[PDB]
């Protein structure tokens with residue numbers, strides 16, 4: 001499988017690693033890819049797109065890299081399964097609620113409740129691993 005994410009300080013990156021750990025513990029392989037190194041054509045071949053990005057500016061997706069990436073794949077993902085995640089700091093998940101609505105509007109099937117964790121996982125480390133296990137169980 002594949003996990004594509006953007007992280008500014010490493011919080012979402014840590015979530016990605018843990019989600020990957022859950023998928024692997026379930027017996028499957030998974031590649032963690034920073035959005036800057038992603039290959040769209042290779043990504044679109046996947047049965048499930050696992051996408052992550054922290055809350056930026058005022059409850060939006062990161063603007064310089066992640067946002068453009070979502071825009072580029074937006075017209076080629078209708079009917080595709082996607083799982084969303086990300087770390088946030090002071091809000092309560094607005095950027096993620098919007099991200100979910102957005103992907104749905106592109107015709108994607110959001111397979112699980114998006115995983116959001118405040119700051120670095122820490123106590124939520126197991127929640128990240130379990131999210132990965134749910135995705136692997138699809």
Ligand SMILES: Cc1cc2nc3c(=O)[nH]c(=O)nc-3n(C[C@H](O)[C@H](O)[C@H](O)COP(=O)(O)O)c2cc1C
Pocket residue numbers: 006007008009010011012013053054055056057058059060087088089090091092093118119120
């Ligand atoms: C410029 C900037 C704007 C932010 N905007 C939001 C926001 O609107 N809502 C929120 O809850 N957190 C916001 N945050 C906090 C980050 O989402 C949070 O620190 C998260 O843990 C960072 O994850 P990362 O290391 O993966 O980027 C913002 C952080 C920065 C640097």
